[PDB]
Write a protein that binds this ligand. Sequence first.
Ligand SMILES: *[C@@H]1O[C@H](CO)[C@@H](O[C@@H]2O[C@H](CO)[C@@H](O)[C@H](O)[C@H]2NC(C)=O)[C@H](O[C@@H]2O[C@@H](C)[C@@H](O)[C@@H](O)[C@@H]2O)[C@H]1NC(C)=O
Ligand SMILES: *[C@@H]1O[C@H](CO)[C@@H](O[C@@H]2O[C@H](CO)[C@@H](O)[C@H](O)[C@H]2NC(C)=O)[C@H](O[C@@H]2O[C@@H](C)[C@@H](O)[C@@H](O)[C@@H]2O)[C@H]1NC(C)=O
Ligand SMILES: *[C@@H]1O[C@H](CO)[C@@H](O[C@@H]2O[C@H](CO)[C@@H](O)[C@H](O)[C@H]2NC(C)=O)[C@H](O[C@@H]2O[C@@H](C)[C@@H](O)[C@@H](O)[C@@H]2O)[C@H]1NC(C)=O
Ligand SMILES: *[C@@H]1O[C@H](CO)[C@@H](O[C@H]2O[C@H](CO)[C@@H](O)[C@H](O)[C@H]2NC(C)=O)[C@H](O[C@@H]2O[C@@H](C)[C@@H](O)[C@@H](O)[C@@H]2O)[C@H]1NC(C)=O
Ligand SMILES: OC[C@H]1O[C@H](O[C@H]2[C@@H](O)[C@@H](CO)O[C@@H](O[C@H]3[C@H](O)[C@@H](O)[C@@H](O)O[C@@H]3CO)[C@@H]2O)[C@H](O)[C@@H](O)[C@H]1O
Ligand SMILES: OC[C@H]1O[C@H](O[C@H]2[C@@H](O)[C@@H](CO)O[C@@H](O[C@H]3[C@H](O)[C@@H](O)[C@@H](O)O[C@@H]3CO)[C@@H]2O)[C@H](O)[C@@H](O)[C@H]1O
Ligand SMILES: [Ca+2]
Ligand SMILES: [Ca+2]
Ligand SMILES: [Mn+2]
Ligand SMILES: [Mn+2]
Lengths: 237, 237
Amino acid sequence: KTISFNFNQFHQNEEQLKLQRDARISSNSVLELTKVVNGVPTWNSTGRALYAKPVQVWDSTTGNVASFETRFSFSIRQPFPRPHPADGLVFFIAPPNTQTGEGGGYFGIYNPLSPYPFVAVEFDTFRNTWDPQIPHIGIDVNSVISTKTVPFTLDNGGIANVVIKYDASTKILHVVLVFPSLGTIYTIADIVDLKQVLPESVNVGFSAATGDPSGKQRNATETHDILSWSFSASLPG
Amino acid sequence: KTISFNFNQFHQNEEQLKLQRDARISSNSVLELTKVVNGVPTWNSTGRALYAKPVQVWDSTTGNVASFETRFSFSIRQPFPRPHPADGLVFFIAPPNTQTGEGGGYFGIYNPLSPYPFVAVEFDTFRNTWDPQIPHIGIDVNSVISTKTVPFTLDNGGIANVVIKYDASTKILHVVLVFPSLGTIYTIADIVDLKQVLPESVNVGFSAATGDPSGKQRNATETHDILSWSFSASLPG
Ligand SMILES: *[C@@H]1O[C@H](CO)[C@@H](O[C@@H]2O[C@H](CO)[C@@H](O)[C@H](O)[C@H]2NC(C)=O)[C@H](O[C@@H]2O[C@@H](C)[C@@H](O)[C@@H](O)[C@@H]2O)[C@H]1NC(C)=O
Ligand SMILES: *[C@@H]1O[C@H](CO)[C@@H](O[C@@H]2O[C@H](CO)[C@@H](O)[C@H](O)[C@H]2NC(C)=O)[C@H](O[C@@H]2O[C@@H](C)[C@@H](O)[C@@H](O)[C@@H]2O)[C@H]1NC(C)=O
Ligand SMILES: *[C@@H]1O[C@H](CO)[C@@H](O[C@@H]2O[C@H](CO)[C@@H](O)[C@H](O)[C@H]2NC(C)=O)[C@H](O[C@@H]2O[C@@H](C)[C@@H](O)[C@@H](O)[C@@H]2O)[C@H]1NC(C)=O
Ligand SMILES: *[C@@H]1O[C@H](CO)[C@@H](O[C@H]2O[C@H](CO)[C@@H](O)[C@H](O)[C@H]2NC(C)=O)[C@H](O[C@@H]2O[C@@H](C)[C@@H](O)[C@@H](O)[C@@H]2O)[C@H]1NC(C)=O
Ligand SMILES: OC[C@H]1O[C@H](O[C@H]2[C@@H](O)[C@@H](CO)O[C@@H](O[C@H]3[C@H](O)[C@@H](O)[C@@H](O)O[C@@H]3CO)[C@@H]2O)[C@H](O)[C@@H](O)[C@H]1O
Ligand SMILES: OC[C@H]1O[C@H](O[C@H]2[C@@H](O)[C@@H](CO)O[C@@H](O[C@H]3[C@H](O)[C@@H](O)[C@@H](O)O[C@@H]3CO)[C@@H]2O)[C@H](O)[C@@H](O)[C@H]1O
Ligand SMILES: [Ca+2]
Ligand SMILES: [Ca+2]
Ligand SMILES: [Mn+2]
Ligand SMILES: [Mn+2]
């Protein structure tokens, strides 16, 4: 069939969402993935938002795979330039009913203990041992070690428009990152076989994380706000 | 092996540009692919601009194929809404030393009498018998009958930002079309093996065309201006 939803803004206690950990909805409508107290982002924070109902990316009966397009706007404000903001946010697809994973450079989607598959598009702002310079957009498959990455300069506190598109017939997952205020455009694409790494039904959502305590740096933090979000998927048959 | 060039604007008879047919450079720096007399675009016009030097997309010795990224800004002003603007502009890669081809729906890159391979990204503004709804972005390979197309709404006379990127390792050619004034974003991608369709050395450039006389409609016209252009290619070879 063909599912599709769309939030032009968020309402406190959104029946259509599942907030986890530090994820909250501010009074003025934005989805704050990581904690921010009195206008200031704190470290040691991790949160995710999933769409309440599961979506079917493929049908084992027909063998068909769904194509999808999702658009969202986010904003990352980095109050403390030194020594290094962290960690970033990601959009991900995962099995339904998963639980927040490790924080820090794992964005809360990777769980070393009990690893579950996931396809995610990351917006990394802190350089871990496995990362190339930052910030960078990355395409992750079952691992936080991106298959493809591309650098980008962040518009601190500005608005970012993202477009993620998946064409099943070509298996191409292409993402676009635009900062309207700077007129800058960033693009990245890679081949991904959803049918090969994910179950027929999945959850889609966001996950973010601020500096991990082990880094011993309270400054290692930033905001991870989601302003709007629309999703559309087509599974012929 | 990295080649690259940037034009933040164009100047009267530039050293590194080969203008063909109606293509000219206005006194105020824009590259006008098709004819415009006294601020008005005319029909029966065709013009191309090629980068003076040839670029190497692949080496037959190593078998390696180059990856590349090119960005440009164009503007299409359609003064006459009825009966229909035509025909559009394209960015293309082709064997070196080619001559302008047929105009009209062929954008000046296809020559029925002496065909030559070419890879192109088109912004089609007229609907020929082989065309789907217009306007649309299309990826063409040796034919003006796109392998993949996506519709888009034009910002009449507005500025358009384009980003074309080719990743050799995945063979993915992804293009992004942004209209900053409307904040709209369009994206399309397909698999293309340059090594399979083009020679080692090629020319890169633009080509446009206005209504063909056979259409018997002088209003079938519009402008095809290129404001800026940057190109970068990397051959590991
Ligand atoms: C953590 O972020 C703090 C807020 O930006 C930094 O402190 C600020 O540092 C400025 C110069 O870097 C200085 O002008 C400000 O007065 C100060 N703001 C306040 C009132 O705290 C801090 O920078 C360093 O550490 C602080 C404690 C001071 O020693 C500064 O002189 C240092 O530059 C950031 N900590 C770091 C860099 O690890
Ligand atoms: C469409 O444009 C062509 C050139 O861009 C015209 O052909 C050229 O016309 C010139 C003026 O008539 C002539 O000096 C050139 O030799 C000739 N060269 C070419 C490319 O064929 C073409 O047709 C001409 O113009 C029309 C108006 C008639 O006068 C014909 O006899 C000419 O061939 C133009 N077609 C039309 C219908 O405008
Ligand atoms: C060819 O383009 C012309 C310029 O836009 C069209 O004329 C304009 O038509 C408008 C309504 O279509 C009218 O409000 C404008 O005043 C007029 N502008 C001028 C000075 O021509 C033209 O439209 C046709 O021809 C005109 C003279 C009228 O009879 C209209 O009813 C016709 O549609 C366009 N011709 C076409 C569509 O083939
Ligand atoms: C990072 O954030 C944690 C919140 O999830 C803090 O611990 C809290 O959660 C633990 C379970 O992991 C609970 O047992 C505690 O009640 C919570 N502690 C607090 C903040 O009230 C965590 O705090 C540190 O670690 C916990 C286990 C306690 O020892 C705290 O005193 C200690 O500060 C926090 N880490 C840091 C470095 O702040
Ligand atoms: O600043 C926040 C970041 O914290 C972690 O990043 C690593 C670095 O901060 C690194 C510094 O050398 O330290 C790592 O952990 C330490 C242990 O704490 C220490 O006991 C010893 O084992 O060495 C290691 C490695 O040096 C931190 O993991 C997060 O992983 C990162 O995402 C940021 O949030
Ligand atoms: O008006 C601009 C467009 O002109 C051509 O488009 C074709 C169509 O307009 C088509 C009508 O359906 O007519 C074609 O030409 C006619 C000949 O004039 C006629 O003698 C006979 O051969 O039939 C054909 C139609 O097949 C036009 O070519 C351009 O092709 C298009 O790109 C626009 O520029
Ligand atoms: Ca990281
Ligand atoms: Ca056409
Ligand atoms: Mn990364
Ligand atoms: Mn077309």
